């Protein structure tokens, strides 16, 4: 939420590489932040189970 | 490994069991009883 | 390539100087559970990157080693190396306790359990509806931050119902009786002899060399399982200074797979299990049956050390599956958001002892851990 | 002395009392029966 004001208007659409990819909606210059990575925070043993549990079902 | 080759066939069985017995309880001289027990090892 | 490290100002100690030889894991206030103040370890190193840490003493009597092994605590208790950073203990009950918002961690106790009949009891000091406790067994191979029962390097006991844990599964094979605020768990742990382990060690040595081995070059991996000797040790345990004080960089085993040797008779994968192991709990001193006959036989060929595959194959060089004085299953205790449980060492604090003849506490083997580790490195001095 | 330099433990008696001349009987070392009397020559 601190680094939300500094981001770029890039959208996601159907990718030219793979299933889903991001499409930069403006001519970004050399060293500007596109997007802060956001998500969970979970350590190495609990993410060791999730590394296989999703691929046990097969995401 | 030369001393590690020769001794580990020999020193690991009896002298380690001789030092696993003196770890339990200790008299005022324990050098007599383990020295006696290694004559029993031969 | 490097020389041995000399002695410093705290190393050579005066007669009246009763300072302790490795620096104490200093106590600091974490939380207040069971109306006691539990305390953390602040500046000591902890086991990371598949390694461990151990106190050394500046031994003066030897020429090659200026450092040999020693310990902090007089009797056995929780080892300080396998510890989290939000995990707390005390000098009153020696219970391990993570914080109120902390997660599933575990701490092993440093008894090195190889052969014989060894028995110790585990105090269950407190349990709530939101708190869980998994006291059980784990190896030196298995680490501390994961609650044990994640792999076949350890088996634990569930909190309610005693569903015996193996690879994340919950087997209700014993008699179910849940923990309460005044409970205790007694691990009657039958291990067979070291001669019985040593002939299973040649069984994985002789069946990984040439039975299924026809990668690009595997004779040099056959050679490490050829020279896979049942008790013999290639140890790299060197002394390092760390946070102004002396410690060890002792090698630790890396994670491996299931040993499935094809017996021709069984027409399937056959597993390596020990000679009549027994996994019994004493919830208040009643027999609950035997859970695990299948404790693994492990010492050279079942756990793989920290070994180098590319630096080392070009050439002197050590062996892949060797031993040390640290290999074995360990007295394990896990906690969940502050589930307080204690390990109990000596028979005066034992409340429910079995009539047996081979009742051996930690401190018989812990004194054997002190007396062997010196003389396992008195062969290193030559 | 070696009462605390070997370790700060009451079970660290060994590096001063017993295992000093046990290793110094091993600095010449061979059979096992002569090792029983290299256990003796600290007394």
UniProtKB/Swiss-Prot annotation, chain A:
It is found in: Nucleus; Chromosome. Belongs to the class V-like SAM-binding methyltransferase superfamily. The RxxxRR motif forms an adapter helix that bridges the nucleosome and ubiquitin. Catalytic component of the COMPASS (Set1C) complex that specifically mono-, di- and trimethylates histone H3 to form H3K4me1/2/3. Binds RNAs which might negatively affect its histone methyltransferase activity. COMPASS recognizes ubiquitinated H2B on one face of the nucleosome which stimulates the methylation of H3 on the opposing face. Component of the Set1C/COMPASS complex. This is Histone-lysine N-methyltransferase, H3 lysine-4 specific. The chain holds residues 851 to 909 of 1000 of the full protein.
